[PDB]
Design a protein around this ligand. Sequence first.
Ligand SMILES: CC(C)[C@H](N)C(=O)O
Ligand SMILES: CC(C)[C@H](N)C(=O)O
Lengths: 90, 90
Amino acid sequence: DNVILELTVRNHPGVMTHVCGLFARRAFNVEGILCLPIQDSDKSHIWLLVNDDQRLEQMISQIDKLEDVVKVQRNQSDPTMFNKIAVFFQ
Amino acid sequence: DNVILELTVRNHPGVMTHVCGLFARRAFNVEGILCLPIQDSDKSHIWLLVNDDQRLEQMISQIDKLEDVVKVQRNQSDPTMFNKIAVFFQ
Ligand SMILES: CC(C)[C@H](N)C(=O)O
Ligand SMILES: CC(C)[C@H](N)C(=O)O
C-alpha cells in the first residue's frame, strides 16, 4: 500500500533537499512528489507518495523537527491524487 | 517569467536529493515540483518550475551530467501545467 505525506514548508532554497535527504540516507524511495507554493505567503505545500512502512513513524518525527518544515501530516489525502494527475501529465 | 524543466530520471532512492542539491548549492529556489513514475519502467519524470535565470543554462548541463538523469528538457511541457494542478489541489 501507499500513503501520502503532506508537508507545509518554507519556500526557500535548500528546503526540498533536506526533506528528501532523510529518505535518501535510509534508501526509502519516494514514488510521487507534488510541491506547490501557497499564494500570498512564504510557504509551499508538499505532497509525498511513499510506500507505508514500519520506518515511516520514526521518519515523521525527524521531518517535523526540521527547521523549515512547518507541519507534517500523514494519510489525510487519498493516495489516488497522483493517479488523477497522471491522467493529464504522463 | 518562468521555465519548466522536464527531467527523465531513474526511479531510485536519492535521485531527488541530488537534483535539488544542485539548486540548493546555488541558492536557487525551485517554485514548483511534480514527480510521477513512468508506467512499466524503472524511470520517472520530474517537472521543475523555476524562474528564468542566467545561471540556468549552466545548471541544466550539470543536471544532465548526473549519473541518474537520463535526459533534461526545457519548455517541452505544457507551460500552464502547474496552474492547472494548483486549481484542484489548492
Ligand atoms: C524519482 C525520485 C523521486 C526518486 N524516487 C527519489 O526518491 O529520489
Ligand atoms: C519548497 C521547495 C520546493 C523550496 N522552494 C526549494 O527550492 O528547495
